[PDB]
Structure 1
Amino acid sequence: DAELLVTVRGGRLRGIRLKTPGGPVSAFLGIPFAEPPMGPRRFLPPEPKQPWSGVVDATTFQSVCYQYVDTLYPGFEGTEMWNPNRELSEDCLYLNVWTPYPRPTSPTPVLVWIYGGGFYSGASSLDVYDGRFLVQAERTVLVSMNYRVGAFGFLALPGSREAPGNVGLLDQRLALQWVQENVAAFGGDPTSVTLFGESAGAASVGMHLLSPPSRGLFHRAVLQSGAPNGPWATVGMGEARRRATQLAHLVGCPNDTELVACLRTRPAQVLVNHEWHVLPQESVFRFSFVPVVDGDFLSDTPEALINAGDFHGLQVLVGVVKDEGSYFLVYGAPGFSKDNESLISRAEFLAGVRVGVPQVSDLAAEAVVLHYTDWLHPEDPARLREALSDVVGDHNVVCPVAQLAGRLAAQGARVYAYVFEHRASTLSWPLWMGVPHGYEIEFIFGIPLDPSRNYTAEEKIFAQRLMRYWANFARTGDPNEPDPKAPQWPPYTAGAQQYVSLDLRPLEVRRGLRAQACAFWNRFLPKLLSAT
Structure 2
Amino acid sequence: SELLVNTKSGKVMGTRVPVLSSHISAFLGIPFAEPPVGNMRFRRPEPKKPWSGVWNASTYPNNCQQYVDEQFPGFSGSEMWNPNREMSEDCLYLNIWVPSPRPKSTTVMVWIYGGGFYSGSSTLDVYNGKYLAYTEEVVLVSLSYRVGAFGFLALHGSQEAPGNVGLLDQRMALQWVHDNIQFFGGDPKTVTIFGESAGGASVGMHILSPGSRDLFRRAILQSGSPNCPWASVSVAEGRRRAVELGRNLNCNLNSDEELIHCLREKKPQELIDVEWNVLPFDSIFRFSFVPVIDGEFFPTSLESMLNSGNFKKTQILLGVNKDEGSFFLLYGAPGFSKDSESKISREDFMSGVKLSVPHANDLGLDAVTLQYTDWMDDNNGIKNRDGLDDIVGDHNVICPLMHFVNKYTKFGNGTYLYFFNHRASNLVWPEWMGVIHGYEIEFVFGLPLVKELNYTAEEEALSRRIMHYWATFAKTGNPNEPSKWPLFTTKEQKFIDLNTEPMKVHQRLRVQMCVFWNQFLPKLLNAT
Q: Flag whether TM exceeds 0.5 (same fold).
A: yes
Per-residue deviation at 1:303?
A: 1.8
What is the TM-score of this pair, normalised by structure 1?
Answer: 0.98
> Is 2:38 the partner of 1:39?
yes
Distance of 1:281 and 1:101 partners within structure 2 = 52
How far apart are residue 301 of structure 1 and its match? 2.1
Q: Give the corresponding residue for 1:348.
A: 348
Indicate whether 1:74 and 2:79 are aligned. no
Partner of 1:232: 230
Quote how far apart the aligned CAs of 1:494 are. Answer: 2.3
1:496 aligned to which of 492, 496, 500: 492
Distance in 1 between the 2:237 and 2:508 partners?
35
- Does 127-136 or 20-29 show the bigger shift? 20-29
1:354-390 deviation line (CA, Å, top 9, x unaligned): 0011121111110100101111111111100100110
- In 2, are the aligned partners of 1:124 and 1:144 still within 8 Å (CA)? yes
Q: Give, in whole Å, the separation in 1 of the partners of 2:34 and 2:312.
A: 37
Residue of structure 2 in register with 1:252 after alignment: 250
Give yes or no for contact 1:420–1:503 (8 Å, CA) kept in 2: yes
Q: CA deviation at 1:313?
A: 5.0
Q: Which amino acid aligns with 1:322?
A: K
Instruction: Give the match's secondary structure for 1:501.
Output: strand
For 1:335 and 1:216, locate their aligned partners in 2 and report how far apart those are by CA, in whole Å: 47
CA RMSD of aligned residues (A): 1.0
User: Hey, what's the Cα distance between the residues in 2 that align with 1:313 and 1:235?
Assistant: 25
2:323 matched residue in structure 1: 323
Cα pair 2:354 2:365 within 8 Å, conserved: yes
| Residue in structure 2 matched with residue 415 of structure 1 by the alignment | 415
**Does structure 2 conserve the Cα–Cα contact (< 8 Å) formed by 1:197 and 1:222?**
yes
Deviations 1:148-181 (A, max 9, x none): 0000000000110110000000000000000011
Aligned to 1:261: 261
1:91-138 deviation per Cα after TM superposition (whole angstroms, max 9, x unaligned): 000000111000013x11110000011000001000000111000111
- For residues 410-449 of structure 1, the aligned pairs below 5 Å read 410-449=410-449
Asked whether the 8 Å contact 2:66–2:119 carries over to 1, the reply is yes
Contact 1:115 1:123 in 2 (8 A): yes
| 2:156 aligned partner | 158
Q: Which runs of 5 or more residues in structure 2 are unaligned?
A: none
Where does residue 242 of structure 1 map in the other structure? 240
Distance between the aligned counterparts of 1:467 and 1:377, measured in 2? 42
What percent identity do the matched residue pairs reach? Answer: 59
User: How many residue pairs get matched?
Assistant: 526
How far apart, in 2, do the equivalents of 1:417 and 1:193 lie? 20
Q: How does 1:239-388 map to 2 (within 5 A)?
A: 239-254=237-252, 255-310=255-310, 314-388=314-388
- Residue 57 of structure 1: aligned partner: 56
Distance 1:90 1:388, change over 3 A: same
Deviation at 1:469, TM superposition (A): 0.2
Aligned to 1:195, the other structure's residue is in SS state strand
Give the TM-score normalised by the residue count of structure 2: 0.98
Distance of 1:310 and 1:510 partners within structure 2: 29
> Deviation of residue 203 (structure 1)?
0.2
**Matched AA of 2:109:** L
Question: For residues 448 and 312 of structure 2, what CA distance do their matches in structure 1 show?
Answer: 36
The letter of the residue matching 2:479 is P
Residue 413 of structure 1: how far off its partner (Å) = 3.0
**What secondary structure does 1:193 align onto?**
strand
Q: Counterparts of 2:259 and 2:347 in 1: how far apart (Å)?
A: 43
Counterpart of 1:188 in structure 2 is 186
| Runs (5+) with no aligned partner, structure 1 | none
Deviates more, 1:329-338 or 1:17-26: 17-26
Q: Is the 8 A contact 1:311 1:413 kept in 2?
A: no
